[PDB]
């Protein structure tokens, strides 16, 4: 729509506007004419309609730039980092996980990757339904002989095959990210931080374990597994210590979601029915979020 | 499929598509259609000339034809669109050619591939992902063998993957993708060998009735002939 | 009751131990292809469900 008000965003790639209930995202056109991450982010967000992925009302052309629409309210990152412990493990940890996995499964059954998943990518709504957006490095799931990119997702939310250097991966790299969203939501801390380097591999090995030959096979075919040594995987003494605010069935699909095996990683069709939402209490979308 | 961009705003019927032709010839009359088919053949052979996959050739043909459904060939000349559509097709589904590497492999000097780019996306109205019959070829390459075991995979890997692919490139040169869904175009072009393949496939498959689908595939064959 | 996904289930069948595809079954025998999480049934489930998307008509266009 042709309505504008005050701006959000200090980034030089895009500065988003606001107006009407909507938010106009403008890509500055002024090398190449149009960037990869403008057509790459309109061409899959145009064709999805869901209550967990935002949609386009109009994509009307500007004089030089490209206009989109977005959502009004802020994101999941400002919810976690600044509160007075409103969020409670009976109900608030279940509904947002259920809706984010619903959005991830709607991306997956359209065979679209969406390899940029962050709490500043997951954003809420006035009725509190969390949305999946910002498809800036998304890609359709191609033919198996096609070579993909490498560094496609951010550091703190990176799948370990992307740490190791998997050039042509599957779409199981975005279940690891939402499992880290689960742990970041029930721990209220930035989970697995790195020092702007290759140190994400060492902190992931320190947290969840250096993969062994017997279990996730062919991990030594990356020219990175020989650089380091083995670390012990965590046992079920993690149930009380460092994860004491959790239920019995939460650790089952958390450990099934933080599998470092990508072939044995639980896809969303077996994460939406992983008997964790069946346990009491039932969730409800009125949550005390400002 | 109804949530996809190809169904909700660029899938047509015969009366709606002929109405689209006469309104883009009325807002801007029979030489335009075989002119854009000739230049579609030109962009097909120059896209196949510069060593591209069959997926990006199909998207380039569809982008060129979808550009010239909304604009005529006189107020935008078709001799300059034919180098821009390969660029937006290869930048669409990640081919990854650069601009200068694309210009040195073509007859372009970096300006002739970028000026007709904003208006091509405006007249295209940003339906930049397209569904193509090659993944239904790889699906019905496998679903024949699952339901049938009598006469399989000798001639069907001998002379089907090298023939039906070229027949669907010739189909994308014609006007069939605005009519039917790409599995229906796939099963139409599989009816070249209808001695024992397609009739024995659709009879034993059976929520979806069979005879309506045979009539849809038969009238699609009447369109393509 | 409740549903985890509101409407997200197709009713068609699949059997991945039958086919003899010369583009993926030979591709999965390599070393670096397995190491990125690739198996045969994921690609076949990707392509066979795409082969059945949209079996409608032209009557459903107005
Ligand atoms: N719908 C929105 N409502 C409010 N703020 C938004 C909205 N969308 C984006 N923003 C802001 O735009 C910026 C996102 O731009 P970008 O850097 O491209 O995302 P990313 O870091 O995932 O790559 C963020 O600062 C975000 O706060």
Give me the domains of chain B, ranges plus CATH numbers. Answer: 5-124 (1.10.472.10), 134-224 (1.10.472)
Dist. CA A44–CA A140, nearest whole Å: 8
Q: Which two tokens stand for residue C41?
A: 């049934």
Give distance in angstroms: CA of A69 to centre of ligand 1.
12
Q: Which two tokens stand for residue B179?
A: 């009519």
Residue A84, CA atoms < 13 Å, CB-side half-sphere? 2
A252 has catalytic annotation: no
Residue A53, CA atoms < 13 Å, CB-side half-sphere? 24
- Residue B122 in contact with residue B66, Cβ under 8 Å? no
Q: Inter-chain contact B128–A42, Cβ cutoff 8 Å?
A: yes
- Residue B16 contacts C where some CB pair is shorter than 8 Å: yes
What DSSP line would sit under B115-177, residue for residue? TTSHHHHHHHTT------THHHHHHHTTHHHHH--SS-SSHHHHSSTTTHHHHHHHHHHSS-T
What DSSP line would sit under A230-249, residue for residue? --PPP-GGGTTTT--S--TT
User: Which residue in B55, B78, B52 sits closest to B67, CA to CA?
Assistant: B78
Resolution of the model in angstroms: 3.5
Q: Inter-chain contact A221–C35, Cβ cutoff 8 Å?
A: yes
A16: helix, strand or coil: strand
Nearest by CB to C4, from A145, A169, A272: name it: A272
Neighbours of chain B (3+ CB pairs under 8 A): A, C
List C-alpha distances in Å: B219 to B1, B180, B225: 21, 10, 10
- Residue A7 in contact with residue A17, Cβ under 8 Å? yes
Dist. CA A136–CA A16, nearest whole Å: 14
Q: Is A13 annotated as a binding-site member? A: yes
Quick one: CA dihedral A145, A149, A150, A155, positive or negative? Answer: negative
Please report residues of C whose CB lies closer than 8 A to that of A277. 2, 4
B197: helix, strand or coil: coil
A123: helix, strand or coil: strand
Q: Which two tokens stand for residue A31?
A: 């090398």
| C44 in a structural domain | yes
Bond before A282 cis per omega within 30 degrees: no
List C-alpha distances in Å: A270 to A175, A208, A249, B128, C16: 11, 22, 14, 32, 18
Q: Which two tokens stand for residue A203?
A: 């902190």
| C39 in a structural domain | yes
Nearest by CB to C19, from B14, B142, B207: name it: B142
| C43 in a structural domain | yes
Dist. CA B69–CA B177, nearest whole Å: 13
B201: helix, strand or coil: helix
- Residue B181 contacts C where some CB pair is shorter than 8 Å: yes
Give distance in angstroms: CA of A4 to centre of ligand 1.
17
Instruction: Determine the structural domain holding residue C25 and report its residue range.
Output: 18-49
Please report residues of A whose CB lies closer than 8 A to that of C5. 102, 105, 272
Q: Which two tokens stand for residue A162?
A: 């992307």
- Residue A48 in contact with residue B3, Cβ under 8 Å? yes
- Residue A73 in contact with residue A124, Cβ under 8 Å? yes
Dist. CA A126–CA A128, nearest whole Å: 5
Indicate which residue's Cα is closest to atom 1 of ligand 1: A71
Q: Which one from A116, A134, A199, A213 is the annotated catalytic residue? A: A116
- Residue B208 contacts C where some CB pair is shorter than 8 Å: yes
Indicate which residue's Cα is closest to atom 18 of ligand 1: A14
Q: Which candidate in B10, B91, B117, B132 is best for mutational testing of the A interface (most A CBs within 10 A)?
A: B91
C positions 25-44 inside 8 Å of B (CB): 44
User: Which residue in C18, C10, C3, C7 sits closest to C46, CA to CA?
Assistant: C10
- The contacts found for B191-199 with CB under 8 angstroms, 24 or more apart, are B191/B217, B191/B218, B191/B221, B192/B163, B192/B164, B192/B167, B193/B155, B193/B160, B196/B151, B197/B144, B197/B156
Whose structure tokens read 């320190």? A206
Q: Which two tokens stand for residue B181?
A: 């869904």
- Residue B134 in contact with residue B58, Cβ under 8 Å? yes
Ligand 1 pocket residues where CB is under 6 Å: A 8-9, 11, 13-14, 16, 23, 70-71, 74, 116, 118, 120-121, 123, 134, 136
Give distance in angstroms: CA of A133 to centre of ligand 1.
9
Q: Inter-chain contact B3–A43, Cβ cutoff 8 Å?
A: no
Please report residues of C whose CB lies closer than 8 A to that of B183. 51-55
What DSSP line would sit under A132-197, residue for residue? E---TT--B---TTS---S--S-GGG--HHHHHT-SS--TTHHHHHHHHHHHHHHH-S--S---SS
Ligand 1: which atom is nearest the Cα of residue A54? 1
For chains A and C, CB pairs below 8 A equal 64
- Residue C15 in contact with residue C48, Cβ under 8 Å? no
A14: helix, strand or coil: strand
Dist. CA B60–CA B84, nearest whole Å: 9
Sheet-wide strand order for A25-27: A14-16, A25-27, A66-67
Residue C19, CA atoms < 13 Å, CB-side half-sphere? 23
Q: Inter-axis angle of helices A173-187 and A92-109, to 10 degrees?
A: 170
- Residue B157 contacts C where some CB pair is shorter than 8 Å: yes
Give distance in angstroms: CA of A260 to centre of ligand 1.
29
Dist. CA A165–CA A148, nearest whole Å: 11
Distance linking the first and last C-alpha atoms of chain B: 26
Q: Is A11 annotated as a binding-site member? A: yes
In angstroms and rounded to an integer, the radius of gyration of the C-alpha atoms of chain A is 20
Please report residues of A whose CB lies closer than 8 A to that of C24. 144
How many structural domains compose chain C? 1
DSSP A53: B
User: Which residue in A79, A83, A122, A82 sits closest to A100, CA to CA?
Assistant: A122
Give distance in angstroms: CA of A129 to centre of ligand 1.
18
Ligand 1: which atom is nearest the Cα of residue A121? 22
């Amino acid at each position: 729509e042709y309505t504008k008000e005050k701006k959000v965003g200090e980034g030089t790639y895009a500065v988003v506007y606001l107006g009407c209930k909507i938010a106009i995202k403008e890509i500055k056109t002024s090398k190449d004419g149009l960037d990869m991450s403008a057509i790459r982010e309109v061409k899959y967000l145009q064709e999805m309609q869901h209550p967990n992925v935002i949609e386009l009302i109009d994509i009307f052309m500007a004089y030089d730039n490209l206009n989109l629409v977005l959502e009004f309210l802020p994101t999941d990152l400002e919810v976690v980092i600044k509160d007075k412990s409103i969020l409670f493990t009976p109900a608030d940890i279940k509904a947002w996980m259920l809706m984010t996995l619903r959005g991830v499964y709607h991306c997956h059954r359209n065979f679209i990757l969406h390899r940029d998943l962050k709490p500043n990518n997951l954003l809420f709504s006035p009725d509190g339904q969390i949305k999946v957006a910002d498809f800036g490095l998304a890609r359709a799931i191609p033919a198996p002989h096609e070579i993909l990119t490498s560094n496609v997702v951010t550091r703190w939310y990176r799948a370990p095959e992307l740490l190791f250097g998997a050039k042509h991966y599957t779409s199981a790299i975005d279940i690891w990210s939402v499992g880290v969203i689960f742990a970041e939501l029930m721990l209220r801390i930035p989970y697995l931080p790195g020092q702007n380097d290759v140190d994400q591999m060492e902190v992931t090995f320190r947290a969840l374990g250096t993969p062994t030959d017997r279990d996730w096979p062919e991990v030594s075919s990356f020219m990175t597994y020989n650089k380091l040594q083995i670390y012990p995987p965590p046992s079920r003494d993690e149930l009380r210590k460092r994860f004491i605010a959790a239920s019995e069935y939460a650790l089952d699909f958390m450990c099934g979601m933080l599998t470092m095996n990508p072939q044995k990683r639980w896809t969303a069709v077996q994460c939406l029915e992983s008997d964790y939402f069946k346990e009491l209490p039932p969730p409800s979308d009125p949550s005390s979020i400002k | 499929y109804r949530h996809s961009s190809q169904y909700r705003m660029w899938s047509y019927t015969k009366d709606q598509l002929q109405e689209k032709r006469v309104d883009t010839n009325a807002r801007a009359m029979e030489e335009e259609l075989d002119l854009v088919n000739f230049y579609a053949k030109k962009v097909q052979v120059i896209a196949q000339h510069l060593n591209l996959p069959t997926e990006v050739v199909a998207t380039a043909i569809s982008f060129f034809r979808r550009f010239f459904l909304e604009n005529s060939v006189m107020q935008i000349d078709p001799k300059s669109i034919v180098h821009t559509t390969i660029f937006l097709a290869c930048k669409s589904e990640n081919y990854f050619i650069s601009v200068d590497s694309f210009a040195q492999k073509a007859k372009s000097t970096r300006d002739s591939v970028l000026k007709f780019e904003f208006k091509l996306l405006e007249s295209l109205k940003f339906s930049l992902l397209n569904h193509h019959p090659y993944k239904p070829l790889h699906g019905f390459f496998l679903d024949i063998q699952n339901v049938l075991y009598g006469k399989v995979d000798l001639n069907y890997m001998g002379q089907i993957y090298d023939r039906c692919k070229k027949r669907i490139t010739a189909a994308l040169l014609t006007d069939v993708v605005y009519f039917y869904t790409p599995p229906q175009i796939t099963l139409a072009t599989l009816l070249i060998e209808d001695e024992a393949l397609v009739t024995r496939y659709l009879e034993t498959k059976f929520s979806i009735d069979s005879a309506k689908l045979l009539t849809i595939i038969r009238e699609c064959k009447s369109i393509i002939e | 009751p409740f549903n985890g996904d509101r409407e997200a289930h197709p009713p068609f069948t699949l059997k991945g131990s039958v086919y003899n595809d010369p583009f993926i079954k030979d591709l999965e025998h390599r070393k670096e292809f397995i190491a990125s999480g690739f198996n045969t049934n994921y690609a076949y489930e990707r392509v066979l469900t795409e082969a059945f998307m949209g079996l409608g008509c032209v009557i459903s266009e107005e």
